[PDB]
Structures are given as C-alpha cells and as structure tokens.
Amino acid sequence: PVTENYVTVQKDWKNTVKKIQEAIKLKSVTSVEVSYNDKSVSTIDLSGKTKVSELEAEAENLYNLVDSKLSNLDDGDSVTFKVTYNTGFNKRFYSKSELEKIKTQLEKKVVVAKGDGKAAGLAMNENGKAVVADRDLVASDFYNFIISTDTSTGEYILKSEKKGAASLDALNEKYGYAALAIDGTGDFGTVTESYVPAAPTDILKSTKQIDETASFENTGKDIAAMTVKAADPGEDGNIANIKVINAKETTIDVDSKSSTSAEDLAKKYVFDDKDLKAVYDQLNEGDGTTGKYVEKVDGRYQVVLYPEGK
C-alpha cells in the first residue's frame, strides 16, 4: 500500500476530476474526501456499490460538487482530494483501453511456428505437395475476439469465437499439420491434416488473467482456445493526495533550441538554493533517479520546481 502526493494546477482541473471518475467506474476507488482550503467538507464512500450504473452516478456527484469552486478558484485557495483505492484485477475492472491492448496482443500471438521439416510440424501447400511453410500462424487466423459488457455488473469483458467455415476453409487449403517429416514431394491431403481449434469457453474479466501457458497450446493438430486463470494479487488501501492550486504551469524542454534559458528563467522567478542544491546533488549520484527530487517518466528525466515568488 503506497501513499503518494500530487500537486496540480487550476487550468487542468477538469482532466484531474475526469481521471478520478474513470477510477470510480472501474470499482477501484473506496472513498473520496474533498477539502476546501484544508477544511474537510464532504466524503464519498462507494463501498456498497458493485455495478457500473451505480458507480457512474457517484462519479457525476463528484463533478457537480466541486464545479463552481474549482471554476472560480482565487489566488491563495486550494482544493484537495484524498482518494483511497485498491489495486489488482481481483479487486477492480478491466478498462476498455486495457482490453483493446490485450486483444491486439492476442490476435498477433504465434500459435504454430514454422519448422524445418525434419520432424512433425507445420506444412504448406506447394502445387499439390507439402513443403516447408513460409510463415508462422497466429491466433487471428483461427479466432476472432469481441469486447462486450457483462449483463450482471456492466463491466467490459473480452471473449473469443471460432472463425467462420468460409475463413477456416480458405486456410485449410494452404496450411496443415504434418505428422511425420515432409519430403516436399508428398501430396497435401495425404501427408497433411488440417488443424482443429477448440471451442472457447472462458471470458476475460474481473478475477481473471490470461494464462499464456495454456492459451493456444499445441498438441498435434489440436489447438487450445484462449484460457484464463486467477489474477495476480494487489494491495488494499492506497492513498493519493491530489491538490489543486491556482498557479501557471510552464514546461521546458532542455534539449530544444527555443527553450527558456536558465538565465531568463532566473530573471522571472526567484528560487531557493536549498532545493536547487538538493537536485544538483542527487544528479551526481548514480543515475540520479534514487531520491525524491528527480524521476524518470515516459523515458525522460523529469524535475519539478516551485519558485518562491517572482
């Protein structure tokens, strides 16, 4: 269970609340405590709710609660959200984004790899004879994948289906299973069988995760369907403290020619050297990431500075 702090600005407040609503609709958020100028005013507890329709309404109430306050925030005032959430797919829903990524990955996963022909394996049709195949076969050659929702809870889910006989036949006349080493001169229908995909029975949703060992297991000409197992465990009761202030946010790319120079940034604002020295000292130790003044995000070094004034 992690406790982390975050500071956000006023002109990006709609995005920050949007994110909290998105976590609520995934059933992760247990409570949200809203405070005006360090004064607790309201609390939202989502313990009993276990359906997307129920979570959507409590998501809307949060936006309606802090709409006029954040829209008219004055210099010196602040708003704080204390969010308690759980982690792990045995405690939250899959989002549609996460399911779409898994879908692409499953569609392109290799199910039958091309062999040398010196033993049993994949054979391809060459003018009536079975020769070494030109490519590997993938799951999307046999199955098609569908994203829908559960009729009990409303969470997004992922399921698979056998392709049509038309699509599968078009494949059966080109690739097949050779149960013995192919000499490249043996007839296709005689030296090759067609692969048989199994009927899918599992669905990816809460409490489940893709079992990459069982899924698409090859046993001769048989191919297993997408199989799921118990999801990995997560921690309970993480805290995220998100503050919203009325400050201008400015980003500088040090690796650019147009970026603000350290000289011109120092004429505008006034900085504390106890913090500037804290940053400099950390960047003289290893990679410079161990410590709270520098971090790596999306493959880049990031440092956040708050000037004392202008």
Next chain:
Amino acid sequence: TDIENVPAKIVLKADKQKDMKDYIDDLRTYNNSYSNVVTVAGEDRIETAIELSYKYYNSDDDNAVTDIAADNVVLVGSQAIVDGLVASPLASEKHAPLLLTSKDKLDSSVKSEIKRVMDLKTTSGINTSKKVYLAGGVNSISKDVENELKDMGVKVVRLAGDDRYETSLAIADEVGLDNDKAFVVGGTGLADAMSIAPVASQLKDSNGNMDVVDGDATPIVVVDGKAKDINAATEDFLDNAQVDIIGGENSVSKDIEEAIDDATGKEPNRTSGDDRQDTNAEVMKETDYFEKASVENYFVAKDGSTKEDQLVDALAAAPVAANFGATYTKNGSTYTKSGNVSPAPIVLATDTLSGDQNVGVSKSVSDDGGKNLVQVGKGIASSVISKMKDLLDM
C-alpha cells in the same frame, strides 16, 4: 512561500543526466547573481551612509548586522576623513552604525536616521544608555552639531585632539588594547588605513576566534612617518602589543619601525604594496587577515584616486563588512547572534581593477564561489563590477 501562493509550477524535461545537471548548475549561478549582487548608494555621500544604516542596522533585512535598537552612534564629518580615519573599529565594537554629517549644521536626514536606529520615539523617553560619539575637532564637526545633539536629550562624547595624530589616539584609547594587538598607519596613508578597516573591525575573543557578541576590535593608530622617532604619547599607548604596519617605507619609514620594535619588544609586521591598489590586494593575500580559499562575501568602493575625501564610503561600510553573515539580537535580557560570521574585505577601485587585486580575490574566494557582492556608493564603473562578478562566479 506556501504552495497555495507560489506563482508557477516549472516542469523540466531532459533526455540525458548530464544535460539536466548542467541546466540546474547554470540556474543556481544566475539565481544567486540576480538576488545577491546589490548596490547601496543614494544621491550623495551623506545619503549613502544613511542607506547603509537603514539596511543593516535595526532592520528586517535577511543579512542585517543587527535587528534590535542600537544604543550608540558614531558621527564623522563628511569632509574629514583625516579626523575619523580610525572610527570604524569603534563603531563595530560598540554595535553601532557610522554616519556622516555636514560640518556646520546637523542634517535633517541624519537627525531622522539617528532616531530610527536608536528607537527614539516621542511616546517614550531617552534612557541613560543612549550615547552619540563625535570623531573630530571643532574644525571637523562644529559646536552647533554638538549642541543640537545635546538639545535632543542624548549623551555626546567628542573624541578629538590638537591634530589628527592626537585624535587617532583618543579614538584608539576608546577602542581598547584588549588582545595585545594594534594597527599602525602613516599620516599620508588614507587608502592604506581604509584597506585594513574591515580587518581591524572584526570582533575576536582572547583566543583569536570570531565572536560578534563578546569579541573586541583592534585599534588603529596614525603616526607621523616623516620623523626619526615616535612621541611619548604614542609610545605610552602601544605598551607591549603586537604591531602591524599598513603601508610602504615612504609612509612609515624603517626608523619608526625600529622605534616600535624597541618600545614594544616585539618585531612589527608590515603589509605593503607598490601603490594604493596593490596594498589593497596585499591585505587580501595575507593569511592572518583572510585565510586562503575561505571568503564568500565582498564589498566594493571607490579608491579616491581623483579626490581623497571619497574614501568616506568605505569608512561607513567597513563595520558592516566585518560582521557580515551574522545578526545581533536579543532573547529576553540576553544578547546573542543569529547565523554565522564570514567577514568581507573592501576592494578599492573607481575606473579599473589592478591585476594584483585579481589575484587577491581569486586566492581568498572559496571553491564554491561568492555568496554576496555589495557595491557601496555611486561612481564605480560597471567594468570592474562585471570583472568582480566573473571572479566570484556570479
């Protein structure tokens, strides 16, 4: 400042660890430069001393010398550098500012500043701890200034003699030879004495350590170096104290040096250069005064090449430079300090900066660079200021 009141949120992005560190280092340099390179000047010399007193005495400045009401004040004539030449160590030991007035009339600006630093207010009275010292005779500070101060209702003590040599003795007698040490300069060594005023004004306990609460200053004595000997009054004062002479042989000759050797029983030391600016540089190079690679703050003032009377700017600033970094305050009936002391020298230069001085600053400055640079008064060329900023990494 609190996060609810910060003006902005800066986010810095970089690919490589080096390019990020180099940006921060440059940011540090310009941040310190723009903050702590200040100029305390005003319209004339009289305003300049007032500007220094308002900023550093009885003030809420981040680098003030004292933030409590002052009990003493030292007054010098604005055109009498000869009289008040040794007045700086007195101001420093008495925890007082050094101010300038006109010879004839007590200027209204000085009248007001004395009230502010001393905390004189019509709602309360002047108690018996409120004294004002006068450095100079009646041809330096007239009787009118003396009597107008007395009508105000404070104590006035004129320290003066028949000439500059007697006057220096009166002032030095007031400072006190508490650590068996004194400085000697020649009657013509105006800038030479001004280069040692920041050193003399440092407060040190009996074991030679910095102590702004309990320490004592080091008196300065002016002698006539165009004689064959020293007079009795001078000889009586020095007793058996270690003597440091500031100036060349053409200011304090070898026979006066020998005279001090025999009268004291202790071989006198001497720091001297080829001209005014070289002697200034030599003071920086002497390890007894400023240890190598350990100075963080620097002051700049005019050298008086065109007119000697302009040395008063350094005269008023010397007590501040000797106590820079600490602040004199109270906590009940107990006096104490706030911070740590790091005395500063005064560089003397109006138009150009001698190469000797360049070596002086480079030796004295710490490896981490300069923290503060203060420009006292107007008239100094920006060429020397940029050169000083470069020398200090600022």
